[PDB]
């Protein structure tokens, strides 16, 4: 089955997660949520590998992420410190 649970907590590696996040409501997909788009090389959640492109993103430090723009889930990521607590799920479709 797909659909396995993660928290996620990361700490960065100088400055860098390493997620480049896409998605949203409101935009061009259909979907609602928060997507793994690509993961940077030589990243914190890029190594880590809980994190991996095509997952899907539930919650950033407590924040749902559900009903979200494509802005606020980047913003949110900007807007982290140094230890950074995500909570996301291991694909919908394989």
Not at 33 to 49: C, F, L, M, N, Q
Not at 54 to 82: C, F, I, M, P
């Amino acid at each position: 089955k797909p659909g396995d649970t993660f928290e996620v907590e990361l700490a960065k590696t100088d400055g860098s997660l390493g997620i480049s996040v896409t998605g949203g409501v409101n935009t061009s997909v259909r979907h609602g949520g928060i997507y793994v788009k690509a993961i940077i090389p030589k990243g914190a959640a890029e190594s880590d590998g809980r994190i991996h492109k095509g997952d899907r993103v539930l919650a950033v430090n407590g924040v749902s992420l559900e009903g979200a723009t494509h802005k606020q889930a980047v913003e949110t990521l900007r807007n982290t410190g140094q230890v950074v607590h995500l909570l996301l799920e291991k694909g919908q479709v394989p």
